[PDB]
Structure 1
Amino acid sequence: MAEIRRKLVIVGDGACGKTCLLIVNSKGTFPEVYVPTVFENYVADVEVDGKHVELALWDTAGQEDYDRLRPLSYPDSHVILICFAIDSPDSLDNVQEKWISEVLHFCQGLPIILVGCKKDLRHDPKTIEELHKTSQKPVTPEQGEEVRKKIGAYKYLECSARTNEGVREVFEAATRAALLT
């Protein structure tokens, strides 16, 4: 009749898992071989709280000219996902140092969901050994929440595209936030 439509943009450091998160949500299977730099614009059907919502998914990047093109993704958004990877504390530090200022510049007043990706790596032995070489460790859930509070984000959620853990909750949270906007 007239489906409810909302727009989502997802941003965050390169290789933090944005495109795979979109693919798993949309297509349902983790891509083991070919991953595009950005997912195709796609409209997701999200069932939340008894409503069918169409959520347009806008993927972004920074390599090449994608940084320059990124601002063209923000207009008329309803919800922003700022992502980092749990196996990369550097990518969490970039949330405050780079991403929040960008998002607030272009999307003042929109709800932001902070998303910790690659949850499956939190106890992964190779990840733990790699990070021990620079006296680092995986991001903890508390660390993610503390960043959420610092940036005024609407919610903090963790997920793993590889195991699919927490993916539905991400998009259900984002849709609920978008419906308020």
Structure 2
Amino acid sequence: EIRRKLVIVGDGACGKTCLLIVNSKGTFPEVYVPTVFENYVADVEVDGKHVELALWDTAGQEDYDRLRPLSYPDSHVILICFAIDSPDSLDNVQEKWISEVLHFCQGLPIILVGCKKDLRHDPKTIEELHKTSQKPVTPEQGEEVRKKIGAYKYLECSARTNEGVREVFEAATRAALLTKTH
């Protein structure tokens, strides 16, 4: 039995829990419950190998800054997430999340994950951001941040539509199988 540990971090409401549950359970949560700390598990098949990937969900809320790092030890891959309909959430990837991850997870592969990809072209979302002179995050913007934080890959996904959800955890599992070779 091959076992690896994934930890997902990023701003509150950036869409971490919905990504984990859609990958592992296969249904979008009908109701929104802010996370404190939860652990899931998913069978991931990449390159003929079956990996039991432990999904360590964390609190994006800054009120839970203190106890969040208890999730990090013995991690094999880190997903730092942001919401594509929130440029501010991509800022916090650089301003908060990379500093924390690097304090506790020296030498790990990081996948930068743009969540809520379905909201980029959402006419409702575009109109609402345009009111505050904001635009949804572009793939080029995520690509530059990926490069600046030294993230291995940048992947865009939508838990809502299940677009690019599998590609996130397949890349994460491959990365985790390199981090530890036993």
TM range (shorter): over 0.9
Name the counterpart of 1:46: 44
The count of aligned residue pairs is: 178
Q: CA offsets per residue over residues 37-89 of structure 1, 9 Å max, x none?
A: 25741221100111000111100004385321101000000000000000000
Q: Secondary structure at the match of 1:40?
A: strand
1:74-125 residue CA offsets vs partner (Å, 9 max, x unmatched): 0000000000000000000111011101111100110000000000000111
* Between 35-44 and 156-165, the greater mean CA deviation after superposition: 35-44
Query: 2: distance between equivalents of 1:159 and 1:63?
Result: 21
Provide the TM-score with structure 2 as the length reference: 0.93
Deviation at 1:129, TM superposition (A): 1.1
State the 1:135 CA deviation: 1.3
Which runs of structure 2 are paired with 1:1-181 in the superposition (5 Å)?
3-33=1-31, 35=33, 37=35, 40-63=38-61, 66-180=64-178
SS for the counterpart of 2:67 is helix
Contact 1:23 1:39 in 2 (8 A): no
For 2:47 and 2:92, how far apart are their aligned partners in 1? 34
Q: What is the CA–CA distance in structure 2 between the aligned matches of 1:40 and 1:27, rounded to whole Å? A: 14
Q: Is this contact kept in 1: 2:34–2:59, CA < 8 A?
A: no
> Given that residues 35 and 60 in structure 2 are in contact (C-alpha distance below 8 angstroms), is that contact kept between their aligned partners in structure 1?
no
Comparing 149-158 with 24-33, which one deviates more in the overlay?
24-33
**RMSD of the alignment, in Å?**
1.4
After superposition, the C-alpha distances for 1:120-172 in whole angstroms (9 at most, x for unaligned) are: 00011111111112211000011100100001001000000000000000000
Runs of 4+ in 1 over 4 A off after TM superposition: none
